[model samples]
Target: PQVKIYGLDSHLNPQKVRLSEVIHRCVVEALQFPKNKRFHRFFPMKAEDMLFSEDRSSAYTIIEITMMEGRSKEAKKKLIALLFKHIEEELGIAGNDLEIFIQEAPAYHFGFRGMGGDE
Candidate 1:
């Protein structure tokens, strides 16, 4: 079977749902890591997958994302949309694929470990 890169977080572990191969490919393509060996290492998925909820509540993963202020909202939304589209097109994973939950947290919410950001 083929492997693909999906979402990024501090750590990868079982029970944590991740993006499908299709979604991983899309991000890898966008990031221009087609031949990157890191992409070869996959974050294994459970029987179920994790996704952000439309309401942006709850937690699956807390990513270390950076974006200019005011633009984060729009950019984040579209980026997520792109992810969903890729998954749907590539894996035929519809709404029944899994339950999606999301929550907005400031970088400081987890201290500096959340990566660089103005407090």
Candidate 2:
């Protein structure tokens, strides 16, 4: 599984850099991910590809995580809380501009690298 980040293309280069760094760190620590394996994808959106509420800025972002199912309820909640805290404090992005969702499934159902994710 991987972390997906989506935000407007107008985000400054430095902002994007910091976001990927902070996000990966948060997930790696909270999920106890192995240091040797990291997967992330960033989608910088254009105006035509996104729609937003009138009150939000271009900083509107979405984070989606799809991972193997095993983390505790508390751990999952911690990920959300820590994400909201870090991204807001570090990136100056408002909570209203950010959305997060976590989806989990049996590892065997997904393909990764040369084999099923369960391997």
Candidate 3:
């Protein structure tokens, strides 16, 4: 029910931690995720393992957020805009260096709290 972040190992620092905070706040405000439901994972990968366009710098990052379906289109767009702005301003990551994907699945497909999402 969360995010998977990918980026170069060198980008990990206090700044990255702050970026995470900003991302979490975006989810709380835009996506309406509960304060206690925050979930994020980062893959600080080696340069060789992470690949992107030549124009992109070490700051290139990919954020994939998967969730149960139900959010409106405008709500999703709001989250996207928030992430783009906050990540660029707070993390020094340009929009071109960032790729965001939102995937939705039926609630019944997810399992949580010892029950299926449909439960």
In Å, residue 72's CA in model 2 sits off its true spot by 1.6
lDDT (tens digit, per residue) of candidate 2 on 13-112? 4477899877877887787877757677888888778788899888889899888887899999988988999999999988998899999998787896
Q: Quick one: RMSD of model 1?
A: 9.8
Model 3 per-residue lDDT tens digits across residues 1-119: 58888888888543567867888988998877787786888888899999888999988889899989999999999999999998888877888998899999999989998999989
Lowest summed lDDT window (length 10), candidate 2: 8-17
lDDT of 1 by residue, 4-117 (tens): 333323333432344434444544554444544332344433424646556532223322333224334554565556656765564444544423232455544433535664
lDDT of prediction 1 = 0.42
TM-score of 1: 0.37
Name the candidate that leads on TM-score: 3
Candidates, ranked, TM-score = 3, 2, 1
lDDT on C-alpha atoms for all candidate structures: 0.42, 0.84, 0.86
Please give the TM-score that candidate 2 achieves against the real structure.
Answer: 0.88
Off by over 4 Å in 3: none
Candidate number achieving the greatest lDDT relative to the actual structure: 3
Sorted on lDDT, best first, the list reads 3, 2, 1
Q: Which pairs clash in the backbone of model 2?
A: none
